[PDB]
Curated annotation (Swiss-Prot), chain B:
It comes from the Eukaryota. This is Photosystem I reaction center subunit III, chloroplastic. Plants lacking PSAF have altered thylakoid structure and are not viable. The chain crosses the membrane at residues 80-100.
Curated annotation (Swiss-Prot), chain E:
GO terms for cellular component: chloroplast thylakoid membrane; photosystem I. It is a single-pass membrane protein. The chain crosses the membrane at residues 7-27. It is found in: Plastid, Chloroplast thylakoid membrane. May help in the organization of the PsaL subunit. One of its GO terms (biological process) is photosynthesis. Keywords: Chloroplast, Membrane, Photosynthesis, Photosystem I, Plastid, Thylakoid, Transmembrane, Transmembrane helix. Signal peptide: none annotated. PANTHER family: PHOTOSYSTEM I REACTION CENTER SUBUNIT VIII, PTHR35775. It holds the Pfam family PSI_8. Belongs to the PsaI family. This is Photosystem I reaction center subunit VIII.
UniProtKB/Swiss-Prot annotation, chain F:
The chain crosses the membrane at residues 5-25, 68-88. Belongs to the PsaG/PsaK family. One of its GO terms (biological process) is photosystem I stabilization. Not yet known. GO terms for cellular component: chloroplast; chloroplast envelope; chloroplast membrane; chloroplast photosystem I; chloroplast thylakoid; chloroplast thylakoid membrane; nucleus; thylakoid. Its main location: plastid. Keywords: Chloroplast, Membrane, Photosynthesis, Photosystem I, Plastid, Transit peptide, Transmembrane, Transmembrane helix. It is a multi-pass membrane protein. This is Photosystem I reaction center subunit V, chloroplastic. It is found in: Plastid, Chloroplast membrane. The lineage of its organism: Eukaryota, Viridiplantae, Streptophyta, Embryophyta, Tracheophyta.
From Swiss-Prot, chain H:
The PsaA/B heterodimer binds the P700 chlorophyll special pair and subsequent electron acceptors. PSI consists of a core antenna complex that captures photons, and an electron transfer chain that converts photonic excitation into a charge separation. The eukaryotic PSI reaction center is composed of at least 11 subunits. This is Photosystem I P700 chlorophyll a apoprotein A2. GO terms for molecular function: 4 iron, 4 sulfur cluster binding; chlorophyll binding; electron transfer activity; magnesium ion binding; mRNA binding; oxidoreductase activity. Keywords: 4Fe-4S, Chlorophyll, Chloroplast, Chromophore, Electron transport, Iron, Iron-sulfur, Magnesium, Membrane, Metal-binding, Oxidoreductase, Photosynthesis, Photosystem I, Plastid, Thylakoid, Transmembrane, Transmembrane helix, Transport. The gene is psaB. It comes from Arabidopsis thaliana (Mouse-ear cress).
Length: 196, 153, 42, 80, 33, 99, 67, 734
């Protein structure tokens, strides 16, 4: 377990934590309270991004959008979201912002008030149906799996955002389609090396 | 054509400046005999002027409304030769000097009275140290990595 | 010559020799490559 | 008038007194140095402020120390 | 008499008030309680 | 939506967040900062006989401790967000991004 | 026992008000009297602004350098 | 307390010499150093002095208003503004000769008068204030406010209302009130003026105190505001044809965000400024309710500073303990205050010329030059004072044991790095700026201007092209139509802003060139070097290797004697004093650049500046020698003209700028040994032994004479350049 074999491990990164492959070049997690805050925020970023990747790929495969087309309707005054074709009757810009704020603020601020640093990241109980917590010998494996898939989804979200930045008006499945059609001449190389 | 500047081989004001300076030299050339030495020096200056303007034409210099070569120092490759290719050629040479005079100061730092080598330069030691700064950038790089570049007080 | 090389090693004599050589170098370069404003040799 | 305070870093070299053109300073007995003497300053009211005392003090910074203060006719170097 | 008012006040502030202030402040400068 | 509805809904949803959601965070941050300390002592403790924290205005009854000053605060945020909504909606402005 | 450094020991200075602050020096001599407040005479390679290369320093205004 | 005139100091009162007089004048407002002083009495004297300053400010503004109301042609100026000269005040000089009365009669006046180059005409005309009775009423009201401030300053010195030391140290309630009320309610009230008065005044009708409760600033009236339909206040923007002062082409809107200039006045829209002051009023009223005062909510600035300690300790202890080194230290407060004030004064100068707010203030050219020069020299002085008071804080008020390892002690931990890298930046800038200027001087000298090093300012032209200036072809965020910036603002303000900035005749984002690059780097040299001197004096205020006990000698002291090589000008005061020279040089550069760029724009030949600003004989010939002809011809042997006073003031400023050199070059010791001979001669001259001084006539003190030389120097600098910049800009007026 090491992000780069041959590099020395930080003394505070032993490998016991889930996904602790010793990757701290800049030295951010040197004090332990910041490291617990960073673990909580890593898992939060991870869970949001890996929930987001289906919400980006699926509505582009079948939902008739491309994950930014789902936002353009709010940029134009007059027009509401096309949740699978049908328009939503819950208003367009301001009231969805009200519901989003009033819902996620309550959820995330009931998350904030937790003091146990393990429940701050792995609460369980109501958030653990199906009883996938009653055996730590596999729960550690599942925590490593969560961390790994979540870091993968975070990198995939960088892929989404930067493929949107390089190609302004497309989506990731269109990028994969272009790479499956002509894989050599339609890759990143035309952007890292701009011809003009 | 960056920064709203026509190139100097195409700028009419640049050619007008050339013709004005050439006429200013020719009006001073009439007062001398065509075979005399002042006249030949003026003619050499005339050819120097003409090929100077031709060279500012061919080297991609950009001329403004005033009709003078402006330097685009931003980073455009077309004009690296205006600032960056000289600039590196400065930072090399300058960094030669400082890497020499520093190294010399480290080589006469361990003397008994090291101040009588500041005012009386050891030419053998200085000549040994001078070419050490030829490939100075790798020495400075490694001394930065080895910590020998910064004294530890 | 002993103690003449120490005098010629002194900072002003050595500075005038170095800057005379250097100034002649720059002067002959500007004779060879007059009126330079770019480095086109790459 | 002025305030010529001295400090215990004095080594008893007697050079500030020998520089003083107004007899502000005077060596006294002391036990804090190899020379077993230190430079007092009783006649501070006669101090002009010329700081010859501290232009002759061979310490790391200074032992005798002139702090310019209320200027009287004796401290303004006035013969009138 | 309103074009005559500058002629009243420019001396009264510029000659008279400066004499008043200079005298009074010179007395205040040299006073001793 | 009529402006009275907008003002009432946004104010209600602001002091609802203040009464129930963002109460313990605001109050614990208040206790954390505590008081303005002039040289260790507070402004009133050091003197000045005018910076006394008023308690006749903060003593109001509530099982959780809501006071009239929080009613003004959550409610100033309320009217502010409401008027932001109202003016932003009443201004027929086209952002027209990318087109 | 002789107090302080030795008559050739290298030393550095922790006196804030000195010219040679955080600069090394050579201990000339240490006065063994336990009544002189500044016994450690130090010699420095470079002069101060008063063209003086030495001053007496205290024991706690000095630090025996490990070089 | 004491006996003689410096009652506040019994050390100068017990001084037989003339130094008593001078030093009692100088140290009069240094309440921190007086006898029998307490922090309470210091704060109370400061408060009463602030009241006195506010009283003098309102009195000076009342004087402006009275002398424009009595002796001004303001009623005639509001008819044809851009072709009628303002009148500052009349002139009754009994030394004037009849030609000088014939010459100084301007503006259609009954006698000789002075031309208001201050812009009070334009500003007053823009905010309403049409007839002279309005200016009379304003002067009466500001006399009333002067008396009110005097009353307050006397009242808050009596024991029944003397505020306590812990009341001036309430650094949360004061910020709360000043942000909310002094900054927010005042901007709100200025919006109230611009809406009830200045916009109706620009659109004809004269809404005054008698008829402002029964006229509607907007035809609906508080329906839009209360109902939230605020767009109704931006309905009729009096588009593109409005004649200022008349109802032709007028509108009904009061807060429309249009951007850009009026077409007629070439100033900003009063609706724009109304909406502006309203917006910042909301922002300042919001920002006020931040600091906890009495009510159980808000922040404590302590636990914001104490809490901003970064983990990892890159700063150290952070701001732990910085509330106490500012709340208890008035010199830190004053340094920060003057820093912000100098920054925003420079901002005032830099925005009032490029975004002129007043009607027909861009059309009178001498006014803009006088205003920019004024506010920039004021800003440079205020900045120099910010730093001087930081040095005085480091000496008098800084407690290192209270702020160990915090973000402020870390300055002194590595002050050598700051000072040496400022000494690198300034040295680089000067070496290269001067090298390029001298290269171009020599190229123009050798008749080869094509060999000049004309480095285009691509990085400022790119910013201009990021604002809509289509003069460089960079096609950036607001010069490119296909962009997010030219889409989210193309419907609100970018029309007017683009049509204003693209106009080559106004001062908004002037077309720059290589001379602008070179002079901007001269400006950077000036700022970096003044900063170097001031920062070096502030951080070496407590001590250095040459004088580690400097804190014990105070801020201003002459020297530390000739010993230790020589300690001339070692104080932090001396650093300030040298930095005033470098500051005046810096502002002279920025204002020479401004005035030549603008006089070439106003004349029409921008090509003159663009081809002549790259070499210094162009600045000496085509700016100083060329534009000073009509000035120095203010009085010739065969007559004089209206610029005679500016020629005389020009030479006067030269004379005192040279007299400062007497005190700066010639130092004491020569003068004491001269005045000793003079005292001998007076005591031995018959019929003058009768007369004898009471104060023994000593020469000027050393630090005093540095101050006096600096005062003569700066007075001459300022008067010379004021005379030249007004005479040249008023001899031709563009
Ligand atoms: C936190 C994650 C996240 C977020 C922020 C969104 C946000 C959004 N989704 Mg996505 N989505 C997600 C997860 C997420 N989704 C997942 C996990 C799935 C798989 C089940 C989908 C499947 C999905 C489809 C199939 C579609 C969206 C659409 C939308 C948009 C409109 C939603 C709406 O009004 O219906 C809210 C209605 C009731 C609650 C909105 C931008 C729609 C869109 O704009 O695409 C064209 C759409 O058609 N989403
Ligand atoms: C693992 C995530 C992921 C995936 C599968 C892709 C896939 C693709 N990208 Mg995207 N991209 C990513 C991350 C990703 N990218 C990130 C993080 C960035 C930020 C710089 C970009 C920025 C980017 C640009 C600007 C462009 C692409 C393009 C492309 C396509 C061609 C490949 C190419 O040009 O090389 C790009 C390859 C990389 C930048 C390397 C990142 C991925 C490696 C393998 C990291 C290791 C991840 C993990 C361990 C392995 C996962 C593999 C698994 C799915 C099988 C292809 C559809 C091009 C296109 O569609 O046209 C194009 O122009 N990508
Ligand atoms: C700091 C500001 C500054 C700058 C940037 C310049 C820049 C320049 N000036 Mg100006 N000048 C300045 C100040 C400045 N000057 C001042 C202050 C004066 C008055 C004293 C002048 C007076 C002046 C005159 C009168 C003239 C110039 C000229 C020039 C040009 C020099 C051409 C030349 O001979 O170099 C050629 C290059 C060299 C001499 C360097 C050679 C270095 C040696 C050979 C070592 C390099 C090789 C090395 C071993 C590395 C190789 C790599 C590897 C294989 C090892 C150049 C544009 C001349 C010109 O052409 O006008 C435009 C000219 O006629 N200048
Ligand atoms: C600080 C503000 C200020 C300034 C700089 C000036 C400046 C001047 N005033 Mg004005 N003045 C002011 C306020 C000011 N005034 C106020 C507030 C009043 C109303 C009481 C007047 C009433 C006034 C009159 C009636 C006259 C002047 C005159 C003058 C000039 C000669 C000085 C005498 O005045 C006397 C000063 C006062 C009465 C002010 C007392 C406070 C001078 C240009 C004279 C003039 O016009 O010369 C051309 C003149 O006759 N002043
Ligand atoms: C011999 C030279 C001389 C003298 C003495 C004067 C005298 C005067 N001129 Mg000037 N003038 C002169 C030559 C001279 N003129 C020349 C050659 C020209 C060019 C043609 C002019 C052009 C000119 C103009 C254009 C104007 C004057 C004005 C004035 C008057 C100023 C009003 C006044 O006293 O306010 C009081 C004076 C002051 C506030 C200035 C003094 C400032 C002091 C030094 C600074 C403060 C120091 C300190 C705080 C106080 C210490 C003193 C204390 C004891 C009171 C005054 C009569 C003005 C006038 O008449 O308007 C009313 C006016 O507008 N003159
Ligand atoms: C809301 C209530 C309130 C208000 C209005 C004020 C107002 C003021 N207080 Mg404060 N004060 C308050 C509450 C308040 N205070 C409380 C509660 C306390 C106790 C904690 C204090 C304690 C206190 C002290 C200790 C002092 C003051 C001072 C002052 C005065 C500041 C000096 C000045 O004129 O700045 C004017 C500055 C501005 C209006 C800011 C303008 C800056 C902008 C950004 C500039 C650019 C725009 C420009 C205005 C346009 C010009 C164009 C043209 C019109 C010229 C001012 C009268 C000082 C004073 O002068 O005492 C008399 C002083 O010493 N106050
Ligand atoms: C402190 C500033 C200030 C003050 C004292 C007033 C005071 C007043 N306003 Mg004005 N007003 C202000 C700011 C101010 N307003 C601002 C900032 C705006 C822009 C939103 C307006 C826009 C406005 C309108 C449109 C109207 C008033 C009206 C009124 C009057 C009745 C208020 C009830 C009263 C004289 C009403 C009135 O009767 O006019 C006099 C009216 O119709 N005001
Ligand atoms: C808000 C503005 C402001 C305020 C309140 C103060 C207040 C103060 N300053 Mg600061 N100062 C300011 C602006 C300000 N200054 C500016 C803009 C500069 C830069 C030019 C300075 C430069 C400065 C220095 C260099 C010094 C002070 C000092 C002082 C103190 C004593 C004043 C004195 O003895 O001279 C009163 C002045 C006069 C009676 C007039 C003198 C004649 C001048 C040249 C022309 C008028 C006092 C606390 C001094 C201090 O702290 O004492 C050691 C000190 O040494 N100030
Ligand atoms: C024209 C006058 C002038 C000039 C050139 C300078 C130049 C300088 N001053 Mg300023 N200064 C001046 C007037 C001037 N000062 C005045 C009147 C005062 C009031 C007392 C001050 C007060 C002052 C202070 C208080 C400070 C400075 C600083 C500096 C340096 C700033 C860094 C810089 O630009 O260096 C770039 C170098 C130059 C501009 C030097 C120009 C000369 C050329 C480039 C050198 C080569 C010439 C030639 C080849 C030599 C041959 C001649 C000979 C051997 C035959 C620099 C040496 C600061 C400083 O030194 O710190 C860095 C500082 O702290 N000065
Ligand atoms: C000595 C001292 C002192 C004094 C000092 C001083 C005087 C300082 C000054 C300072 C200054 C005088 C500063 C200034 C600064 C500035 C800055 C820092 C800026 C920034 C900016 C920015 C950040 C920007 C941004 C932007 C832009 C670019 C434009 C548009 C908009 C935006 C926002 C985007 C004190 C008392 C403190 C203390 C003690 C020491
Ligand atoms: S202060 Fe100077 S003169 Fe006096 S004893 Fe010390 S070293 Fe000698």
């Amino acid at each position: 377990a090491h992000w780069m074999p041959g590099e020395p491990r930080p003394a505070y990164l032993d490998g016991s934590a889930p996904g602790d492959f010793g990757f701290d070049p800049l030295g951010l997690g040197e004090v332990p309270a910041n490291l617990e805050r960073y673990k909580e925020s890593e898992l939060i970023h991870c869970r949001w991004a890996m929930l987001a990747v289906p919400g980006i790929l699926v509505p582009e495969a079948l939902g008739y959008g491309n994950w930014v087309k789902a936002q353009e309707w709010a940029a134009l005054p007059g027009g509401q979201a096309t949740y699978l074709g049908n328009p939503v009757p819950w208003g367009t810009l301001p009231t969805i912002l009200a519901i989003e704020f009033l819902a996620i603020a309550f959820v995330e601020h009931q998350r904030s008030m937790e003091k146990d640093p393990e429940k701050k990241k792995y609460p369980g109980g109501a958030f653990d149906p199906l009883g996938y917590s009653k055996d730590p010998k596999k729960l550690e494996e599942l925590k490593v799996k969560e961390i790994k898939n979540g870091r993968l989804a975070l990198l995939a979200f960088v892929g989404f955002c930067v493929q949107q930045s390089a190609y302004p008006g497309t989506g990731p499945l269109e990028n994969l389609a272009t790479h499956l059609a002509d894989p050599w001449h339609n890759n990143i190389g035309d952007i890292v090396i701009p011809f003009n | 054509d960056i920064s709203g500047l026509t190139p100097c081989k195409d700028s009419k004001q640049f050619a007008k400046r050339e013709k004005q300076q050439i006429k200013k030299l020719e009006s001073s050339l009439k007062l001398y005999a065509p075979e005399s030495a002042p006249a030949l020096a003026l003619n050499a200056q005339i050819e120097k002027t003409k090929r100077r303007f031709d060279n500012y034409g061919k080297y991609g210099l950009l001329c403004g409304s005033d009709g003078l070569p402006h330097l685009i120092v931003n980073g455009d490759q077309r004009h690296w030769g205006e600032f960056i290719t000289p600039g590196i050629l400065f930072l090399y040479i300058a960094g030669w000097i400082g890497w020499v005079g520093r190294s010399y100061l480290i080589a006469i730092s361990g003397e008994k009275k090291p101040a009588m080598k500041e005012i009386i330069i050891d030419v053998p030691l200085a000549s040994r140290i001078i070419f050490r700064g030829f490939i100075w950038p790798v020495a400075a790089y490694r001394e930065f990595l080895n910590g020998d570049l910064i004294a530890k007080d | 010559m002993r103690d003449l090389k120490t005098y010629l090693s002194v900072a002003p004599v050595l500075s005038t020799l170095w800057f005379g050589s250097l100034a002649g170098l720059l002067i002959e370069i500007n004779r060879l490559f007059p009126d330079a404003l770019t480095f086109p040799f790459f | 008038s002025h305030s010529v305070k001295i400090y215990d870093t004095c080594i008893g070299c007697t050079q500030c007194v020998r520089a003083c053109p107004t007899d502000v300073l005077e060596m006294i007995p002391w036990d804090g140095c190899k020379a077993k003497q230190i430079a007092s300053a009783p006649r501070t009211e006669d101090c002009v402020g010329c700081k010859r005392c501290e232009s002759a003090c061979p310490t790391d910074f200074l032992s005798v120390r002139v702090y310019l203060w209320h200027e009287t006719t004796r401290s303004m170097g006035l013969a009138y | 008499t309103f074009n005559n008012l500058p002629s009243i006040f420019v001396p009264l502030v510029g000659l008279v008030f400066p004499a008043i202030a200079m005298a009074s402040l010179f007395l205040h400068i040299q006073k001793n309680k | 939506l009529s402006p009275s509805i907008v003002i009432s809904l946004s104010t209600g949803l602001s002091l609802f967040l203040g009464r129930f959601v963002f109460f313990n965070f605001q109050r614990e941050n208040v206790a954390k900062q505590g008081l303005p300390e002039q040289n260790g002592k507070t402004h009133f403790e050091a003197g000045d006989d005018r910076a006394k924290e008023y308690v006749s205005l903060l003593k109001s009854n509530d099982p959780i401790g809501f006071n009239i000053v929080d009613v003004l605060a959550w409610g100033s945020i309320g009217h502010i967000v409401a008027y932001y909504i109202l003016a932003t909606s009443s201004n027929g402005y086209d952002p027209s991004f990318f087109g | 026992p002789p107090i302080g450094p030795k008559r050739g020991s290298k030393v550095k200075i922790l006196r804030r008000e000195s010219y040679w602050f955080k600069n090394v020096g050579s201990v000339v001599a240490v006065d063994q009297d336990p009544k002189t407040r500044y016994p450690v005479v130090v010699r420095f390679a470079k002069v101060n602004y008063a063209n003086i290369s030495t001053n007496n320093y205290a024991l706690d205004e000095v630090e025996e350098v490990a070089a | 307390m004491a006996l003689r005139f410096p009652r506040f100091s019994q050390g100068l009162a017990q001084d037989p010499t003339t130094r008593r007089i001078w030093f009692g004048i100088a140290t009069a407002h240094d309440f921190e150093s007086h006898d029998d002083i307490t922090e309470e009495r210091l704060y109370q004297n400061i408060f009463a002095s602030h009241f006195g300053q506010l009283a003098i400010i309102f009195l000076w503004t009342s004087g402006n208003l009275f002398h424009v109301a009595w002796q001004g042609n303001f009623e005639t100026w509001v008819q044809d503004p851009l072709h009628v000269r303002p009148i500052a005040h009349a002139i009754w000089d009994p030394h004037f000769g009849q030609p000088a009365v014939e010459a100084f009669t301007r503006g259609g006046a009954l006698g000789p008068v002075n031309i208001a180059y201050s812009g009070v005409y334009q500003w007053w005309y823009t905010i309403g204030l049409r007839t002279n009775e309005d200016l009379y009423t304003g002067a009466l009201f500001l006399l009333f406010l002067s008396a009110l401030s005097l009353i307050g300053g006397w009242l808050h010195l009596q024991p029944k209302w003397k505020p306590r030391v812990s009341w001036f140290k309430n650094a949360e309630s004061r910020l709360n009130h000043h942000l909310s009320g002094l900054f927010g309610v005042s901007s709100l009230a200025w919006t109230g003026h611009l809406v009830h008065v200045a916009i109706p005044a620009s659109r004809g009708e004269y809404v005054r105190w008698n008829n402002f409760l029964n006229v509607l600033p907007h035809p609906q009236g508080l329906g839009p505001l209360f109902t939230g339909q605020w767009n109704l206040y931006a309905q009729n923007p009096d588009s593109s044809s409005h004649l200022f002062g008349t109802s032709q082409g007028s509108g009904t809107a009061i807060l429309t965000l249009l951007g850009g200039f009026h077409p007629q006045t070439q100033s900003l829209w009063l609706t724009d400024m109304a909406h502006h002051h309203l917006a910042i009023a909301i922002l300042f009223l919001i920002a006020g309710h931040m600091y906890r005062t009495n009510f159980g909510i808000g922040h404590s600035i302590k636990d914001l500073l104490e809490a901003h300690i970064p983990p990892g300790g890159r700063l150290g202890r952070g701001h732990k303990g910085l509330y106490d080194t500012i709340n208890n230290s008035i010199h830190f407060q004053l340094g920060l205050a003057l820093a912000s004030l100098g920054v925003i004064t420079s901002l005032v100068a830099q925005h009032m010329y490029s975004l002129p707010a007043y009607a027909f203030i861009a059309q009178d050219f001498t006014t803009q030059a006088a205003l920019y020069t004024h506010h920039q020299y004021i800003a440079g002085f205020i900045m120099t004072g910010a730093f001087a008071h930081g040095a005085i804080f480091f000496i008098r008020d800084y407690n290192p044991e209270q702020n160990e390892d915090n973000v402020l002690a870390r300055m002194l931990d590595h002050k050598e790095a700051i000072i040496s890298h400022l000494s690198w930046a300034s040295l680089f800038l000067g070496f290269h700026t001067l090298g390029l200027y001298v290269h171009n001087d020599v190229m123009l000298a050798f008749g080869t201007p094509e060999k000049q090093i004309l480095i285009e300012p691509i990085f400022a032209q790119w910013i201009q092209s990021a604002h809509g200036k289509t003069s460089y072809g960079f096609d950036v965020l607001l010069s490119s139509t296909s962009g997010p910036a030219f889409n989210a603002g193309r419907s609100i303000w970018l029309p007017g802003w683009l049509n204003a900035i693209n106009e080559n005749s106004n001062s908004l984002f002037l077309t720059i060139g290589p001379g602008d690059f070179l002079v901007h780097h001269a400006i950077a040299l000036g700022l970096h070097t003044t900063t170097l001197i001031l920062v070096k004096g502030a951080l070496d205020a407590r001590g250095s290797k040459l004088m580690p006990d400097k804190k014990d000698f105070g801020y201003s002291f002459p020297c530390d004697g000739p010993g230790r090589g020589g300690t001339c000008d070692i104080s932090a005061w001396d650093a300030f004093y040298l930095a005033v020279f470098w500051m005046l040089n810096t502002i002279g550069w920025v204002t020479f650049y401004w005035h030549w760029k603008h006089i070439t724009l106003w004349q029409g030949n921008v090509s003159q500046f663009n081809e002549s600003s790259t070499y210094l004989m162009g600045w000496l010939r085509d700016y100083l020698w060329l534009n000073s002809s009509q000035l120095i011809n203010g009085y010739n042997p065969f007559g004089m003209n209206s610029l005679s006073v500016w020629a005389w003031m020009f030479l006067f400023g030269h004379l005192v700028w040279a007299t400062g050199f007497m005190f700066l070059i010639s130092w004491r010791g020569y003068w004491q040994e001269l005045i000793e001979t003079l005292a001998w001669a007076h005591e031995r001259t018959p019929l003058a032994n009768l007369i004898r001084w009471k104060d023994k006539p000593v020469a000027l003190s050393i630090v005093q004479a540095r101050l006096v030389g600096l005062a003569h120097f700066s007075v001459g600098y300022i008067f010379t350049y004021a005379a030249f910049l007004i005479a040249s800009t008023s001899g031709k007026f563009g």
